Structure formats: structure tokens, C-alpha cells
């Protein structure tokens, strides 16, 4: 009878950097997606595996709500089968992903006057992330022939970099808040159900 705490996720006052993205396990609750359906101002709302028209008719063993901030231009990367700094080094969906991706422009919240430089992304990595892998390491990245020994310099780089969210920025350089709902189905009791 108690609704799933989608509010806690979507309406959170603070959001995670994409490199250190956040997870909320959602279980043992009714999922009324009408809280999402009645928002006309999400910039994207796409489901993979299920039609979004069926969400209220469906049950899952759990739902995971991954949330973070990226630039406008990078929101197309939060989809199965994408590549780029975000898909490759920050947050990776599986090719057979079942769930929904929702994003909205957050310039109103995530840009201050001096510019907001708190949100980071990973710029360099030895290899691409597996799906739902998460790396929060700050190992100096060895780009060249020669080793680094945790000291920075030529071909030895800090792996993270601030987004600069200035309120003057173009759409593609404005912050977007993203929530990824992963619908998990196991040989187990369905603990997350629509209101039928």
C-alpha cells in the first residue's frame, strides 16, 4: 500500500557526479509511475525492454535507481549501445537493458553565478567499464610509454575533471539530472508492483 520512494531519488536536493554515480535499491512497495507520467518537462523519458505504457501493469523483483549529473550533449550516451567519455568511462548500460532513462535540464539548480565546478567526470581509463561498473579511483593515469608512480606530468594525468556549469552555457554545456530505473527480474518474489 506504501508507494516506492521515487521522490527521494528524483527530488533529491543534491545529485552525484556521474563518475561516482548513486544507487537506490527500491523494493517491497507499490510503483505508481503516474508520478513520472504527469511530468511534462522531463527532456527525455525512454524505456528499453518494456513499453512505458505497461509500467503500471508490470511487477519486478527489485528496481535500482541510479542518479547523477552530466552535460546536455552527453544525455544521448545514457542508452544501451552508446560510446563516448560517459558510456565508456563513467556509466555503462548493458545492450539487453530493461528499464527507463529520465533526464531534465537542471541549469536552475546546478549552475551558480561564479559557475559550479563540483560535478566531476572521468576523462581517462585503462579500459571501458562493464555495464553498471563504477570506478571512484583517483590513480594518476599513465598515457605514455613511461610509468607515473602517482606523480603527475607529461603523459601522466589526473583522471577526473570538473564540468563547468555556468548559467551562460549553451544547452549542450548545461547540467542535466539523470535517473536510470533498472528493472531486475529473478526467480524470486516480485517485491515492486504497479497498482495492478
Amino acid at each position: 500500500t506504501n508507494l516506492c520512494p521515487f521522490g527521494e531519488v528524483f527530488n533529491a536536493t543534491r545529485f552525484a557526479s556521474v563518475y561516482a554515480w548513486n544507487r537506490k535499491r527500491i523494493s517491497n512497495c507499490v510503483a505508481d509511475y503516474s508520478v513520472l507520467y504527469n511530468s511534462a518537462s522531463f527532456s527525455t523519458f525512454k524505456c528499453y525492454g518494456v513499453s512505458p505504457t505497461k509500467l503500471n501493469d508490470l511487477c519486478f523483483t527489485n528496481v535500482y535507481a541510479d542518479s547523477f549529473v552530466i552535460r546536455g550533449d552527453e544525455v544521448r550516451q545514457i542508452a544501451p549501445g552508446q560510446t563516448g567519455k560517459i558510456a565508456d568511462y563513467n556509466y555503462k548500460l548493458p545492450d539487453d537493458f530493461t528499464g527507463c532513462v529520465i533526464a531534465w535540464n537542471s541549469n536552475n539548480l546546478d549552475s551558480k553565478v561564479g559557475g559550479n565546478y563540483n560535478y566531476l567526470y572521468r576523462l581517462f581509463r585503462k579500459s571501458n567499464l562493464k555495464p553498471f561498473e563504477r570506478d571512484i579511483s583517483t590513480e594518476i593515469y599513465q598515457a605514455g610509454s613511461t610509468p607515473c608512480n602517482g606523480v603527475e606530468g607529461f603523459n601522466c594525468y589526473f583522471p577526473l575533471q570538473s564540468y563547468g556549469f555556468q548559467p551562460t552555457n549553451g544547452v549542450g554545456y548545461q547540467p542535466y539530472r539523470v535517473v536510470v530505473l533498472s528493472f531486475e527480474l529473478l526467480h524470486a518474489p516480485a517485491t515492486v508492483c504497479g497498482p495492478k
Epitope: 527532456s43 527525455t44 525512454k46 524505456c47 544521448r76
Partner: nanobody, 125 residues
Framework: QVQLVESGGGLVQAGGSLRLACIAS????????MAWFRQAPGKEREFVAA????????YYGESVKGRFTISRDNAKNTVYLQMNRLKPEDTAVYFC??????????????????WGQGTQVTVSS
């Protein structure tokens, strides 16, 4: 980088019928939601229809509900748009569109990554 190619456009009588086709390059058509949009003279791109992966939800614009039928054949990497009982308001360029994802906002052109150049349909009286 799917490419889409529309066809079947041309001249047709009011009341007449016409089937557009769109073929997608690539080998993953099964995983693409396919849509048709159109642009009539002096207006924006307007949503016509869309089909989910299974075909199992289809969508239609208010103006075309009843008259137009969208369908897909995964074997031929083709989406179809059967247009029946055609009106002059149907005169427009028909654009095929595709995305991995099925949007709640299915009428938004921004919710589709991939776009054909369009086929011209003209309805006379």
C-alpha cells in the same frame, strides 16, 4: 549510424490509398522503435505513427487514427505506413525515424536519434 530510406511517395487521389516503406541499414532493426513524422507546407514536423519492438503497442496522431496503419517486418528491416481514405491535409513530406528506446513523449522529434530525408506525398481533388 543506422541510415533510413523512405519510399512509396507520389501523387494520389483524395479517398485513395498509399503505402510508404522505410528500410534501415544495420542488423539491429529488431531493437529499434520505428516512427513516421510528416511536415505539411508552412508547419512543423508532426508525429504520424510509431511502433514498439514487438509491434505490441502502436501509436497514431489524432488526424490519422482510424485511417493510417503502421506495421514492421523485422526480416526485411522495413517499417510500413498504410494510408487509407487520404485527405488534402495528408499532403506533406513523410520522414521515417528510429530510436533504441520507446519514449513516454513518443510525439517528440527530439526522442528519436535517426531520421530519413523524407518521401513527398501529394493528395489532389
Amino acid at each position: 549510424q543506422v541510415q533510413l530510406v523512405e519510399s512509396g511517395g507520389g501523387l494520389v487521389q483524395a479517398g485513395g490509398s498509399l503505402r510508404l516503406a522505410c528500410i534501415a541499414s544495420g542488423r539491429t532493426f529488431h531493437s529499434y522503435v520505428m516512427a513516421w513524422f510528416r511536415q505539411a507546407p508552412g508547419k512543423e514536423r508532426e508525429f504520424v505513427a510509431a511502433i514498439s519492438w514487438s509491434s505490441t503497442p502502436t501509436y497514431y496522431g489524432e488526424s490519422v487514427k482510424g485511417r493510417f496503419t503502421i506495421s514492421r517486418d523485422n526480416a526485411k528491416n522495413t517499417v510500413y505506413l498504410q494510408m487509407n481514405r487520404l485527405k488534402p491535409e495528408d499532403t506533406a513530406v513523410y520522414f521515417c525515424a528510429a530510436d533504441r528506446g520507446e519514449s513516454y513523449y513518443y510525439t517528440r522529434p527530439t526522442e528519436y536519434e535517426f531520421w530519413g530525408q523524407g518521401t513527398q506525398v501529394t493528395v489532389s481533388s
